[PDB]
Design a protein around this ligand. Structure first.
Ligand SMILES: Nc1ccn([C@H]2C[C@H](O)[C@@H](COP(=O)(O)OP(=O)(O)OP(=O)(O)O)O2)c(=O)n1
Ligand SMILES: [Ca+2]
Ligand SMILES: [Ca+2]
Lengths: 959, 368, 353
DNA sequence: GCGGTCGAGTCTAGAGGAGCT
DNA sequence: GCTCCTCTAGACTCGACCGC
């Protein structure tokens, strides 16, 4: 009788798991709650809909220590976090001697004993160190000097590139050129200090965990983006006295309150050369030591407070596990960089050639004064500068006559050379070409001259004129007093009739128009000058219609190159195809890659058949901030972002370049609507204590993406907008966005909607989903009521782990302010708690059953693991078990001692050799057109479900 | 497209009568022949191919494959030049001293049955790679060939590509061009195995050993066979800019915008009125000056008759004439000659002594 | 005699087995093929002929004559380049605006039966007005004789003679003096208008010219020179076993090499010099890539047999003072000069000769 | 003695980050 | 719902050469 159910006909967990997790017996459902839930479902027409039951899963979960699964998670976290807190507490009671008199000048670590005496040591022989590393930027990114404090001594490290001035060192980083360090390494932004540690790049996980005072600061006293802007502008302000920015000086001011930190204005590590560092050694070392001591004092005043605000050890263990990220890359990363930069340069050059070709075809409008009819080139300068001079067949020639003719032609030709004296000393520059064309074409005397208008670029004010850009069928126009802006017809004299004809042609092929304003001050004969919508607001003028803000408008078909050619739209598409690399090439090409030598690789990788003696394997340790916002979510711009390979983006397959070494496989899976199900379960727990009691939760559970019954599909059908727009709409409204946010989204996505129409649609969408006013009579009324109640509580804490909100956001300091930020924080920090529970449970499973694998990356809701090849199926089963336990804990902490089967397991545990979103993608891009399977040799990957995992693993994690 | 073939016939890119030319005949290879300007364009295209492939590589070598294929009980005209190149593998292993990778290249004619025998001028490259790096060299050559076909074009997006797999399981690539009617194959890179060499050289296989690094191995044969006749036809279709034909509503000049490294005749040299003898001497001197520096010139000054200047300029534009020099009477006293440019159609009076340097700079700046 | 053919075979001038290549096959177009050096020498000869015949002339144009002739007369391979040229008379008359005289020149293969025999030929047809047929014939004869004697090391071997055909049309034939005997390499014929009238029966209106103001029927002239036989003659002309080919024709001109170690340090310098020379259109033999560096005298002998104008040696000194050995094939005299002066000296040597 | 040009300086606008080097 | 520091690239300007 494994087929269990719910009083709302929702298939719950099977008996085999429900009696091993939540215990036998349970609770008799309250008939009043069942009646209320049934009535609510009947109100929204979701009662009695047939749902196909999933097969019931039978599985033998491992022993649950303590009971209730909450004491189990607590015991796991305590067993994991004990040996590092036992070193943090040792640091907190240190007896550190005064700073050394003179820092030693030698390679390696030198132990500074009592009274500042220098003594060389091989490695710091301690279990706790506060760390701060300085690296010369001129020399590259290899570390230069580092200062670390032990519980009982001071330490210093000087690299070979600061002690010995060799002729030249290699440009490839290796573990033999890094800092030679259970251990705990405290620091400020320790991810930067971690990337310079030698042992952190080996595949085998050395049991070292990093505590980042920046992350603890963001957890304790954090600032939202608007709060950060206000704080920076200034430096109702009660919260300013309790929070600070992420600067080490500001953090030290907030937690210690001593004298302000001294930052060297010379900046010999950022701007100065290596010689400056070699000369100011005794001063730079002292500055680094002062920073280390500031970090030490911050840690002393910060560790107990964080534990008092985040009491559950799961949060601390998850934070310790998020610091150790590891992205294995191979020799294909360099090829990716090279073939992305080359394909970016080629596309940029092709766009430049198209612009030059479109410029050359523009000169011909001068003949007959046809340029006066061109809607785009009418207002340019077309002036021409006057130049300032200041019979029968004779037969075959004889043998000598041909030479005579050649000589008399050559001498006559060379006689004309003597006329160069009359030529002016400084030659005139293209007097016959129009005025606007002389500027573009370089001067002949210039040593870097190139044929044609070689000085043409998108930034110039003529490029949107040559391309004949039309904004919704309206030609662009530039006015000095209002920036850019299109011209709407119907109202050198401008060719208004030509603009009218162009707009008629555009409308046939595909007042009335409302935009940024008619702007009658700029009088273009018979036209209205509507400015381009700027992201900063209608009070600012756009300086370029090719700015990154206009890419969605280009893709939507609003800002399109005009007709009459195939080089305008081609240039526009090339512009759209190289945006990502143009914005991220500096970041992506500057990633620190440390090429492990073969001597440092485990025998699993050095003997696998897929191993070649001519390949290089490295590790891009992400410089993540384990608490990057008020919501404690990790922040790293390069990796932790919603990126995926696209057919029209250059070098966008970077995540596909994180290739596991031969012998290892990146097991991992993505959570299915994590932040939607968290809100749904919160609403269900608040309303009636059963899943699906609210219509929103029922739609989330019994919803099919293909059938269109899900939330996003219904939203898009109701509002008649694209699925991505509806998705952003729903996520924003759930995060706490008001009706004004909906109005601006509707106006931006669809230009045909006025402010009145956008307001009407936003009101109609929010009046049937959230309800009316707390909230009543809506699909998501109970969930929003629960979120507002949690946010408005005296000390808002995450329901599933108890982690407290930031001090700069508690309702005491902020009275009636930042309500949206806190309601968003509820769900987002709940998701962060979900991630921490996942990591703790996964580490417990990998440690108890001896599954050889380590954490790799946690991009958004994805959870990847660099598991060994032989243990891939065991790792997949462990992932399924951890997801089950995490969802059960989420339900248990909210008073629901059950869990629907439809959300009790992963849809598919991806098992591939790269971090592509799906194991079926080939990642075809303009940079990588051939595909992953050909350029590099990466086959596809498995997407096992739970049932397929059980059969392969036999149901037992034990080897 | 109908007007483009009329232009090609009239401006002597394509020979034969008007009724004797159809796109089917051009693609099949049974056309009566290419006009002299078409021959010059094909020579330029072949020279650019040779410069890209054989000149710069330190291993690619030229090979000679006979047109006739003797034996299997009579002879036959060759269909592909790959089998001619594969016979020189052992012969040309001595040149590179049995080092790999090394290749053989050739430009020649290919006879393809259609009841009429057609002809095609195809440039091949048999590239003996070690089997370890077959999928690397194949992709490298795909990128290189696609870049080469795209750099000379006014619209590189038309020169698309595809990845079709052979029936036996071998992988390969087919280049294309988006003609107005459809896509036509112009080059193919097949990653053939060592089957062809083993079949062609039965017996002891120690001959077929290239010293890849330190270990001998039977090389993997890669064939890159492009169609130069259809290539130049594609370039002619691309330069005419049929898609372009709201701004050009009245602006309509029939111009073949061939790349400066491909155009058949670079400059057109004319003359105006009198005196006849001195102007003729100046024109002949300038003609020799330009010719001695590798610049083709159309001798327009020899024309006893004279046409209107606009009609002459249209005639030169249809012939892909980069510049139009006009040596008038005034040149004798100051050395100034009108210089109209095809790209812009704007006259600039440049001193006669500076014309050669400017032309060389303009031609060489486009990778010449 | 035989030694030269052996050297050409070993140095990859004439591809094929030693027994496979025979003198009669060489002279009849039935040889297995041309080696890469032979291919480049043929290309150089074609370029020189194209220059001297079509480039510095405003009356000559290229010809596109197909190989097969799909004529019911069941198609056949072409035996002459003349018929394809005559098929273009009505077409190429408009190019010169019907203004006699004018010419049509082509380089291509002729399928002369022997076993199929193929020879690459450079043929020029000259639509002379009838008045000056003999004059232009003598003009072309003088120019072709001087061109064929220009690159030779001894124009005495190159010769000429007169002859007559069955019809009774004057003509001259060229005969290179091969070591075994006097063999033919070129032939000039003063054909009449019957070659043009047979292809265009009646309606002579389209066949008129513009000699002066009157309209005439041009008297075509046939000038066929076997480029492959020219290659053979020039190879025999050059032949210590050294083939002293003319600089404008030799396939490989520069022999870049290495001397002392380290290999890695000198490899970059050699590759840079190689690219520099190649960008200027000077052929270079990449001899630095040879791992098993042979004796310098043996390498010089190999380059002498390969008709290499100058051999370049890069040693340890080049990394410091930039001195490179530059051996001259003609006078076997070693000399040193700065590595930045090599390109200009090579260009000067090529252009001077 | 006089008028056309050439080049530093200033304003403006989009670009990145809100850390650490 | 928003600030700031800094960097590069483009347009316009004033004031000073210098060719005739
Ligand atoms: N418009 C969106 C979409 C997503 N997210 C956040 C919340 C999610 O927890 C996480 C992952 O959402 P995805 O968009 O990657 O996937 P969805 O959960 O939206 O599923 P689907 O994309 O299939 O609708 O990103 C968000 O803030 N705003
Ligand atoms: Ca730090
Ligand atoms: Ca998801």
């Amino acid at each position: 009788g494994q087929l269990r159910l719910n009083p709302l006909l929702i298939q719950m967990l099977s008996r085999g798991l429900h009696e091993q997790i939540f215990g036998c017996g349970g609770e008799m459902p309250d008939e009043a709650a069942v009646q209320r839930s049934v009535e609510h479902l009947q109100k929204h027409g979701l009662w009695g809909q047939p749902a196909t039951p999933l097969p019931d899963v039978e599985l033998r979960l491992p022993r649950l220590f303590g009971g209730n699964l909450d004491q189990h998670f607590r015991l796991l976290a305590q067993k994991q976090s004990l040996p590092y807190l036992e070193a943090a507490a040792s640091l907190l009671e240190a007896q550190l001697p005064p700073e050394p008199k003179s820092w030693a000048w030698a390679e390696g670590w030198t132990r500074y004993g009592p009274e500042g005496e220098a003594e060389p040591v091989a490695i710091p022989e301690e279990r706790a160190l506060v760390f701060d590393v300085e690296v010369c930027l001129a020399e590259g990114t290899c570390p230069t000097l580092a200062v670390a404090i032990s519980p009982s001594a001071w330490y210093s490290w000087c690299s070979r590139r600061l002690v010995e001035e060799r002729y030249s060192w290699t440009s490839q980083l290796s573990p033999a050129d890094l800092i030679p360090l259970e251990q705990l390494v405290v620091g400020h932004n320790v991810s930067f200090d971690r990337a310079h540690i030698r042992e952190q790049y080996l595949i085998q996980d050395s049991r070292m965990r990093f505590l980042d005072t920046m992350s603890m600061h963001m957890a304790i006293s954090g600032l939202s983006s608007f709060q950060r802007s206000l704080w920076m502008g200034a430096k109702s302000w009660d919260w300013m006295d309790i929070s600070s920015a992420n600067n080490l000086a500001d953090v030290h001011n907030l937690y210690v309150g001593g004298p302000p930190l001294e930052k060297e204005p010379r900046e010999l590590f950022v701007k100065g050369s290596m010689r400056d560092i070699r000369e100011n050694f005794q001063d730079l070392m002292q500055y680094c030591a002062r920073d280390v001591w500031a970090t030490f004092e911050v840690f002393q005043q910060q560790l107990p407070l964080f534990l008092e605000r985040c009491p559950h050890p799961v949060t601390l263990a998850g934070m310790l596990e998020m610091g150790v990220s590891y992205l294995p890359v191979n020799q294909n990363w360099e090829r990716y960089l090279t073939e992305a930069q080359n394909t970016y340069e080629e596309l940029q050059r092709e766009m430049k050639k198209s612009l030059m070709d479109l410029a050359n075809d523009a000169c011909q409008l001068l003949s007959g004064e046809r340029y006066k009819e061109d809607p785009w080139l009418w207002d340019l300068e077309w002036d021409l500068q006057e130049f300032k001079q200041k019979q029968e067949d004779p037969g075959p020639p004889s043998e000598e006559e041909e030479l005579q003719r050649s000589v008399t032609a050559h001498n006559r030709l060379q006689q004309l050379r003597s006329t160069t004296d009359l030529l002016p000393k400084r030659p005139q520059h293209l007097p016959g070409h129009p005025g606007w064309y002389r500027k573009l074409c370089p001067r002949l005397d210039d040593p870097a001259w190139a044929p044609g208008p070689s000085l043409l670029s998108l930034q110039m004010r003529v490029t949107p004129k040559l391309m004949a850009l039309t904004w919704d069928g309206f030609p662009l126009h530039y006015s000095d007093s209002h920036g850019w802006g299109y011209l709407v017809p119907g109202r050198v004299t401008c060719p208004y009739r030509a603009i009218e004809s162009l707009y008629r042609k555009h409308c046939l092929e595909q007042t009335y128009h409302h935009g940024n304003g008619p702007y009658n001050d700029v009088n273009i004969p018979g036209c209205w000058f509507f400015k381009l919508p700027h992201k900063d607001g209608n009070n600012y003028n756009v300086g370029s219609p090719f700015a990154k803000d206009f890419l969605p408008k280009m893709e939507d078909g609003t800002l399109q190159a005009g007709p009459g050619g195939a080089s305008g739209p081609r240039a526009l598409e090339i512009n759209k195809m190289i945006s990502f690399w143009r914005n991220a090439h500096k970041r992506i090409s500057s990633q620190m890659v440390v090429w492990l030598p073969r001597s440092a690789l485990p025998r699993v990788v050095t003997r696998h058949p897929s191993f070649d003696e001519e390949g290089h394997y490295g590790a891009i340790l992400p410089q993540v901030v384990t608490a990057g916002t008020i919501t404690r979510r990790a922040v790293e711009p390069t990796w932790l972002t919603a990126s995926n390979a696209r057919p029209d983006r250059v070098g966008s397959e970077l995540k596909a370049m994180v290739q596991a070494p031969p012998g290892y496989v990146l097991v991992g899976a993505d959570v299915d609507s994590q932040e939607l199900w968290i809100a749904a379960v919160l609403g269900d727990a608040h309303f009636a204590g059963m899943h699906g009691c609210t219509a929103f939760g029922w739609m989330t559970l019994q919803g099919r993406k293909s059938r269109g019954t899900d939330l996003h599909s219904k939203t898009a059908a109701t509002v008649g907008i694209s699925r991505e727009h509806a998705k952003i709409f729903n996520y924003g409204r759930i995060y706490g966005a008001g009706q004004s946010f909906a109005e601006r989204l509707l106006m931006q996505f669809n230009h045909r909607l006025t402010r009145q129409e956008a307001a009407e649609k936003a009101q109609q969408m929010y009046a049937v989903t959230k309800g009316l006013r707390a909230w009543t009579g809506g699909t998501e009324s109970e969930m929003f009521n629960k979120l507002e109640s949690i946010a408005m509580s005296d000390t808002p804490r995450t329901p599933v782990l108890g982690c407290c909100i930031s001090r700069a956001l508690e309702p005491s300091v902020v009275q009636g302010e930042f309500i949206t930020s806190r309601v968003n924080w509820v769900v987002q920090s709940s998701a962060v708690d979900y991630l921490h529970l996942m990591l703790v449970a996964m580490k417990w499973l990998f440690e108890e059953f001896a599954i050889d694998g380590r954490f790799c990356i946690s991009i958004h809701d994805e959870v990847r693991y660099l598991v060994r090849e032989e243990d891939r199926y065991r790792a997949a089963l462990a992932l399924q078990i951890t997801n089950l336990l995490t969802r059960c804990m989420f339900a248990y902490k909210l008073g629901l001692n059950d869990l629907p089967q439809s959300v009790a397991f992963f849809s598919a545990v991806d098992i591939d050799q790269c971090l592509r979103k799906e194991v079926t993608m080939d990642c075809k891009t303009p940079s990588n057109p051939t595909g992953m399977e050909r350029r590099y040799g990466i086959p596809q990957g498995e997407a096992l479900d739970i049932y397929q995992i059980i059969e392969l693993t036999k149901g037992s994690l034990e080897k | 497209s109908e007007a483009l073939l009329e232009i090609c016939q009239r401006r002597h890119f394509l020979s034969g009568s008007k009724q004797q030319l159809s796109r089917d005949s051009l693609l099949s290879g049974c056309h009566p022949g290419f006009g002299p300007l078409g021959v010059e364009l094909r020579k330029n295209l072949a020279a650019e191919w040779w410069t890209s492939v054989v000149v710069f590589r330190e291993q690619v070598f030229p090979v000679d494959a006979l047109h006739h294929k003797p034996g299997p009980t009579s002879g036959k005209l060759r269909e592909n030049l790959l089998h001619g190149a594969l016979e020189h593998y052992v012969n040309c292993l001595d040149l590179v001293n049995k080092r790999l990778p090394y290749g053989l290249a050739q430009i020649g004619v290919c006879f393809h049955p259609v009841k009429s025998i057609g002809e095609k001028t195809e440039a091949s490259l048999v590239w003996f790679t070690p089997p370890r790096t077959s999928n690397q060299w194949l992709d490298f050559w795909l990128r290189h060939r696609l870049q080469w076909w795209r750099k000379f074009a006014m619209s590189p997006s038309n020169f698309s590509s595809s990845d079709c797999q052979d029936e036996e399981g071998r992988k390969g690539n087919k280049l294309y061009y988006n003609f107005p009617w459809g896509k036509e194959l112009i080059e193919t890179l097949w990653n053939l195995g060592d089957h062809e060499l083993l079949h062609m050289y039965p017996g002891n296989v120690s001959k077929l050993h290239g010293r890849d690094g330190r270990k001998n191995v039977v090389p993997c044969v890669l064939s890159v066979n492009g169609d130069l006749d259809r290539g130049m036809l594609a370039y002619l279709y691309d330069s005419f800019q049929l898609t372009e034909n709201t701004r050009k509503k009245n602006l309509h000049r029939k111009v073949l915008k061939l790349h400066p490294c491909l155009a058949p005749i670079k400059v057109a040299l004319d003359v105006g009125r009198g005196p006849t003898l001195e102007l003729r001497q100046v024109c002949q001197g300038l003609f020799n000056e330009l010719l001695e520096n590798g610049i083709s010139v159309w001798p327009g000054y020899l024309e006893t008759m004279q046409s209107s200047l606009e009609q002459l300029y249209s005639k030169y534009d249809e012939m892909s004439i980069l510049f139009t020099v006009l040596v008038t009477e005034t040149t004798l006293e100051n050395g100034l000659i009108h210089l109209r440019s095809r790209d812009t159609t704007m006259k600039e009076m440049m001193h006669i002594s500076k014309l050669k340097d400017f032309l060389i700079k303009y031609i060489s700046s486009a990778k010449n």
